[PDB]
Design an enzyme around this catalytic site. Structure first.
Site, short mmCIF file in Angstrom:
data_model
loop_
_atom_site.label_atom_id
_atom_site.label_comp_id
_atom_site.label_asym_id
_atom_site.label_seq_id
_atom_site.Cartn_x
_atom_site.Cartn_y
_atom_site.Cartn_z
N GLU A 127 0.79 -1.23 0.00
CA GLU A 127 0.00 0.00 0.00
C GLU A 127 0.83 1.29 0.00
OE1 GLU A 127 -0.41 -2.72 1.72
OE2 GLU A 127 -2.42 -2.97 2.52
N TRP B 287 19.05 -46.62 -9.07
CA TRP B 287 18.19 -46.10 -10.12
C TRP B 287 16.73 -46.34 -9.74
CZ3 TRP B 287 21.60 -50.35 -11.26
CH2 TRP B 287 22.93 -49.93 -11.42
N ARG C 102 12.54 -27.71 -2.50
CA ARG C 102 13.53 -27.20 -1.55
C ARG C 102 13.55 -25.69 -1.62
NH1 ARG C 102 18.65 -31.37 -2.32
NH2 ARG C 102 17.54 -33.18 -1.43
N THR D 6 19.36 -41.19 7.03
CA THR D 6 19.55 -40.66 5.68
C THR D 6 20.92 -40.02 5.49
OG1 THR D 6 17.17 -40.20 5.49
CG2 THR D 6 18.66 -39.12 3.93
N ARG E 273 19.63 -26.06 -5.67
CA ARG E 273 20.48 -25.70 -6.81
C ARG E 273 19.72 -25.08 -7.99
NH1 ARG E 273 22.20 -29.59 -4.66
NH2 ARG E 273 21.16 -31.29 -5.79
N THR F 50 18.87 -39.10 17.76
CA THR F 50 18.54 -39.73 19.03
C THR F 50 19.82 -39.88 19.83
OG1 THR F 50 18.37 -41.63 17.53
CG2 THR F 50 16.41 -41.04 18.80
N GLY G 172 13.61 -40.88 5.39
CA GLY G 172 13.20 -41.91 6.33
C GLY G 172 11.77 -42.39 6.28
N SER G 173 11.61 -43.68 6.05
CA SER G 173 10.28 -44.28 6.03
C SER G 173 9.77 -44.12 7.46
CB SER G 173 10.38 -45.76 5.65
OG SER G 173 11.29 -46.45 6.48
N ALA G 174 10.67 -44.35 8.41
CA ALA G 174 10.34 -44.23 9.82
C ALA G 174 10.02 -42.76 10.12
CB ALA G 174 11.51 -44.70 10.67
#
Ligand code: AIF
Ligand code: ZN
Ligand code: ZN
Ligand code: ZN
Ligand code: ZN
Lengths: 359, 360, 359, 359
Positions: free
Chosen positions: B52, B170, B184, B196, B207, B222, B293-295
């Protein structure tokens, strides 16, 4: 113009879709002096072929006229004069074939019967759609093995049940309903015994337009199938079980009594390739493999499928121990997992239906 | 319709701020006098002028007796300079078209009131939906005190994350990894479990051409097992916050804090997800892109801590019991307890299919 | 699904276009238990009707079956039993009719004929398409006059030639080719002698497959037509001419020998209503009026057209003496100029085709 | 990216459309360290320039930044530092000009002024789009002649009235309204006296806030225009008349004393090139000619038009003595008729709108 006529024949052929069962979809159109005078398609199993309808409709205009056929006219001598024979007996000048009869020996025999009769034969006209027209039938004739469809339903994270085996609401009624279609476009429905012991399905086509229930195949290594199961007792449709010598003799006797076909494989474990070979030898041209992630796994591992169909629901189940889509051995390294290709991705209700094919 | 045209413009001007406004939401404003556009503005830089101010200044004396379209409720607090509702009032504007009110339920409408007290006509709700999409995450943060969570993962068609032996070379296409990279850029942070880090040793950096102030890196730990070795640590390419617990060593703890690496500590032996996001919501982080992570994904899922699920399926079947799957960990035991979502998108990308779904 | 069949029926009808002479295009599909068991269309003048073909194909399956027909099954007793009768005796239990007969002396006749046999008859499905399909024919039967289409090519400012008569290059090859389509969907092409003198066109259809040629009709008050024009010498298509008593008797003789058929009107000026009546009597049901500005003017004044098709080129030909699209008397007050309705606007090449109709 | 910014500039520029009177639309974007920090357009006649708005907005960030301008920054040393200088004094390192100044006299001065100061100048980015932005203005500068638009309403057969002269409304209400838009985008409206003494128009843009009525130019060979016509009286908009020496002296004084701007040509007939010459001298950058069949013919024969707009009603008027679109002398040979190109086809109510352009 020869294109229009072949197209016409392809559209006329599609009108048989699902009424010829074992027999393929053929379309025929007779043209005399630039005018269509005959049109036909194979509309029923064990009845008049496409060329038959087209030429009778053609009347006397058939003499010195052309005819387009989506699939090489038959030369099957016997209970009737081969369509290749009907084509010359009518004085057809030239015949246009889109593709040859996939049956290896039979391939070319119909063309040769008419050529040696003097008829000019041109082929390959729109062979492309003429191929998609009878995709399963073709495969079965060329390879000798049934066209195989693997179908499974799961959550968005790839689980087919919770870690307590619950799977009451994975995919919506619309998906299960869409899955039913495939039960009428396949000569057989195949699942493992676990499915039967778990759900006791009927594996019958509920769609209100059926008159030829598919064969219900069961892979039962040890013959533990529950004897009271609908697939044995409701006796609504055909039920074939594939076991090994580990089956109980008396039980096979007890089941066969209910009219169940029992195939005893000579191997000690069930090999999909062996089973498929037998189903072809028995006249099955297609199998809709619905269940047993283990069963699916065996199929995937042996490369015994022509098409894959997965229904995904907008739901995340989770669970280290919740059962996945493809169970069993599986490939060890990515350099060895075959690359597929997505053929279609259409939404069905709130879920998503993906379908992929080999190579 | 002409009204919608001006708000459309406003919304479109706002977007040019897309780049840097930091925590500030995108805002646009247009002044029209006697059917003529006479002032255009958008919030362009953090801490600098509001849409404004720019717009009202550009309209000069045409502001008198004019109309103004703002994609968001004009600010009304008292700081170093007068608020925009005041600015509008003082400038002679007869009427204000506000697309949507303020997010902070403690401030919402406060601005409409001022201008209204000054006899200004306040019409609301024009292209409110588009104005809602414009600052979708910001709106969420302000209205929940919670970061916008986006969960993304890439897997086989049969839901596997790797072979039974851990191979995942792959898995998805270069185009899909390309498409993933975009995200990202629309998130302030990038969550990823320590597994990971040691798994592939990532940088978690954007990038895509044109990137200012890289997104904050967040590693859920942890036992502060994060290998001092490299990347998120000794790769001074941006911030790296590591949520840990008691079992975290004392020595190496401050050893890593030496690299400007942050070290948060939770009073539990389990890094409860809701605690992490709440901490982030404190640190000004308004959005999190969890891809590892699947967890780690399981936790956010069981806890119900997400606004977006984005999966990339490749035309590949891996199979194999003991083949890791998309989401692991606890999960739901009863089907009646599975939250139903909604697919909001189906996009083919290269040989792969990307599926995006949202909650209820 | 009912519409699916009717549409199949409408598509089967289209296969007999330009092969039925004066009769309409009719499609017929016999459906039994969800299966298409018979298909048919009228393909040859004086030859079997759609229902005749469909029922024969249907065979035994006709029993209790359903049949979809695009035009009311005939009901008069000629050499062969009417189709309504053919249906009754075949066991068909339900009949889906798109539209009734265009004749007021027949409409519904067959319908009631079939209900009276205990058959269930439903009407109106896809009536619009069934209406379009034989549109010209329909018009001919309801009004007793041929369907007239006026066609012209002009410059953007409405000129059909410069002030010197030059009209070379007013329409593109694309436009001329597109306009040729009508020389195939009309039974006659009409122009005034003026056009024969200036351009000496053949007025023939030169598209790919062109079995029959339309009748070339010239309006020639004094029979001053050039005796060496194509329309009189090429023998590519019939040529008919309309004159008055002023024509030279020895010239008609000379022309008759060339095969030209002449019609000597009893008036002193050619009346479009007259000629249309005579063409009708000869069984000409459609006229493609390529023009002459004055010729169009009369057709417009009398209100003897069903479709107007002008091709406009991206060019401006000025001139006070440049001839416009429609000459003749025309209307005097804007209150008397009938209103039309633009029916289509298509760009063909660099030109733009505008087609419109009355009311 | 380079072009993304220039696009945004062009987008900002379109915002001042209609608000700049005779000034060109111009946009500008200041980009600092990959971020938009300034944006401006020229919104009002005689007020701040595009660059001025963006430079202010950008403030401190201007130093060492880039700036994308849709039109070369001004370089006249009037009563303030021109934009070229302003850019310079601001520390902007680079400048992206989409296109140079249309005035051959100045075209380039700016670009040089900046380059001669260490500024890196790159022109051409999205030059074609920046050219469509100010089409009419650019034409004026590049040719010293007004951009001209010929507009007419006719029947489908190209007549602009019946052989009686009745133009009691060929096209629809929707049609006339749509045409006003032009009386809004052109600095003048032109008709012949024929049009004036038959419709007694106002030739005013009765659209929304006009804030400036277009000049009314009438072509009067003998100055026979009625001294009671709206354009002469009504003092709503300026009115210029072109005549020859056949006009009465007193009549020229009366009218001149009533405000009418009379121009006299020393040639027997009025010559279009001359009127456009005069009009451009008097500032007039564009003219909308919608009146006169003969007036339109003169503009076409001379080749003096950048645009032609024809509205076709779904009506057929007819009549050989009915006025057609373009009269005048016109082209005698089709090989001399210039090729135009259709630019847009839009339906308006029941009428069709065609627009074309030269070469
Ligand atoms: N006859 C027609 C036209 N006629 C247009 C000119 O002949 C009129 O003199 C002129 O538009 C009058 O302008 P006014 O009085 O200031 O509104 N123009 C149209 O669009 N449709 C027509 O049917
Ligand atoms: Zn056969
Ligand atoms: Zn503010
Ligand atoms: Zn009949
Ligand atoms: Zn300037």
């Amino acid at each position: 113009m020869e294109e229009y006529y072949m197209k016409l024949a392809l559209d006329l052929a599609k009108q048989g879709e699902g009424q010829t069962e074992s027999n393929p979809l053929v379309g025929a159109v007779v043209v005399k002096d630039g005018q269509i005078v005959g049109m036909g398609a194979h509309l029923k199993y064990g009845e008049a072929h496409a060329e038959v309808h087209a030429i009778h409709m053609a009347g006397a205009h058939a003499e010195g006229a052309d005819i387009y056929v989506t699939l090489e006219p038959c030369s099957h001598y016997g209970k009737t004069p081969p369509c290749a024979e009907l084509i010359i007996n009518s004085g057809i000048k030239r015949v246009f074939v889109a593709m040859r009869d996939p049956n290896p020996l039979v391939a070319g025999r119909g063309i040769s019967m008419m050529k040696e009769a003097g008829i000019e034969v041109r082929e390959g006209i729109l062979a492309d759609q003429a191929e998609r027209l009878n995709e399963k039938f073709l495969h079965f004739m060329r390879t000798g093995l049934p066209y195989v469809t693997l179908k499974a339903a799961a959550s968005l994270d790839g689980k087919i049940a919770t870690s307590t085996g619950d799977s009451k609401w994975i995919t919506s009624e619309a998906a299960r309903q869409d899955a039913q279609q495939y039960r009428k476009t396949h000569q057989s429905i195949l699942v493992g015994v676990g499915t039967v012991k778990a759900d006791n399905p009927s594996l019958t086509c509920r769609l209100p337009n059926v008159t030829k229930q598919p064969v219900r195949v069961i892979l039962d290594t040890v013959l533990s199938i529950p004897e009271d199961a609908k697939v044995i007792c409701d006796q609504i449709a055909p039920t074939w079980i594939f076991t090994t010598a580990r089956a109980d003799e008396e039980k096979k006797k007890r089941l066969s009594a209910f009219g169940v076909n029992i195939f005893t494989l000579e191997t000690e474990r069930i090999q999909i390739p062996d089973v498929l070979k037998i189903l072809a030898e028995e006249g099955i041209m297609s199998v809709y493999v619905e269940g047993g992630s283990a069963v699916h796994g065996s199929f995937v591992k042996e490369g015994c499928f022509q098409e894959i169909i997965f229904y995904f629901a907008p739901k995340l189940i989770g669970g280290t121990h919740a059962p996945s889509l493809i169970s069993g051995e599986g490939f060890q390294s990515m350099k060895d997992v075959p690359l597929l290709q997505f053929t279609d991705i259409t939404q069905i209700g709130r879920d998503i239906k993906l379908t992929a094919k080999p190579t």
